[PDB]
Design a protein around this ligand. Sequence first.
Ligand SMILES: O=c1ccn([C@@H]2O[C@H](COP(=O)(O)O)[C@@H](O)[C@H]2O)c(=O)[nH]1
Ligand SMILES: [Mg+2]
Ligand code: NA
Length: 291
Amino acid sequence: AVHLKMMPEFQKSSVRIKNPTRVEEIICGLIKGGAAKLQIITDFNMTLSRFSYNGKRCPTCHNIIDNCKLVTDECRRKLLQLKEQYYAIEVDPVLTVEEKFPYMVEWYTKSHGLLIEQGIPKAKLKEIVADSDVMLKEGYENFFGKLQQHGIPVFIFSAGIGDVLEEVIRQAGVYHSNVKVVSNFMDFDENGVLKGFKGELIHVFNKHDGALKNTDYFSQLKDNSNIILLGDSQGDLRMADGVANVEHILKIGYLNDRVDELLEKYMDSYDIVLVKEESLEVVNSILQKTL
Ligand SMILES: O=c1ccn([C@@H]2O[C@H](COP(=O)(O)O)[C@@H](O)[C@H]2O)c(=O)[nH]1
Ligand SMILES: [Mg+2]
Ligand code: NA
């Protein structure tokens, strides 16, 4: 039997669980199924990466570009002001997902617009990432390492910038063959200069869409009917909507901001809520018991 009270990682003060007996049953199911049944579906920004470190906010994939040498100070100022305006709406506890939706579309339209104006060169992405302040969560090496050791499919489903996310994980040495990335990927002109983005926009509140547009992937993983889903947003709860067969699914949510206002809604919607938590210790502990 799984007993959360016997697991110290689950007693940390950042760990909030509305229904601990259900979480026990789920984890029991994951352990029963083992490697052969497991797959991971995860957000990227503020889920695999840190929201803050030493009381300083850490960059998202977009911010990595916002803050880099290839963007003028005037442009950075505009982008920073856009983030102040639109992040405030993103996390606003009063607004419904449906009311936030159009503002997210608008943010990305404005943000990508400006990045295209700045003409970001493909050849500079390696340096841009290496020079940035991006930080993955504590325990990332063991998370990706254990998953690759056991050939567990990992689907990273991000509303950020795919090229940047890939370069982050490549540089951290964790972009193993079991990792599939779906995000907004840059489109480059003949000179290697940013001219637009590929495919349909993925934003905070339409991941339910892209979840259904990856059937090649999920239909090949029909046997992988036990899922661990990691997210930081209410939008992330939809990322497993394309999964072929779900037997047991555990949803772990990082709650990074507006904690008191959002705690109830997060505890109702995610099985395990990790409040202001910069490590992957809880998911790593589950994987240790499962694999
Ligand atoms: O111009 C933008 C657009 C989005 N985001 C952030 O990107 C995150 C989406 O990436 P992910 O969390 O889905 O990986 C959103 O939470 C949003 O705050 C930015 O920082 N700048
Ligand atoms: Mg996120
Ligand atoms: Na590299």
